[PDB]
């Protein structure tokens, strides 16, 4: 499931988009984004795979490693602490074109 890093590069995020450059099945490369916003949750100061506008409680998204997403969300206590999750998870590449799944 996911690993969409191992046919995408140069990828890049800002904000809640996540950006890449894939290859498609028939061969040539593909470029496409897709909010994750309707996919990733804030509980309690960790990221989850739900929606709920996480971007609405956590600042500085930035790309970190291969295919980890690393920010700061806002914990009950209205405290800003690290928290990260695994991209590879539910993204895949499905022909050149990103999708959750």
Excluded: M
């Amino acid at each position: 499931l996911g690993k969409f890093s191992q046919t995408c590069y140069n990828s890049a995020i800002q904000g809640s988009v996540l950006t890449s450059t894939c290859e498609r099945t028939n061969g040539g490369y593909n470029t496409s984004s897709i909010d994750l916003n309707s996919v990733i949750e804030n509980v309690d100061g960790s990221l989850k795979w739900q929606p709920s506008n996480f971007i609405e409680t956590c600042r500085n998204t930035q790309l970190a490693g291969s295919s980890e997403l690393a920010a700061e969300c806002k914990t009950r206590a209205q405290q800003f602490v690290s928290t990260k999750i695994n991209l590879d998870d539910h993204i895949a590449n499905i022909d050149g074109t990103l999708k959750y799944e």
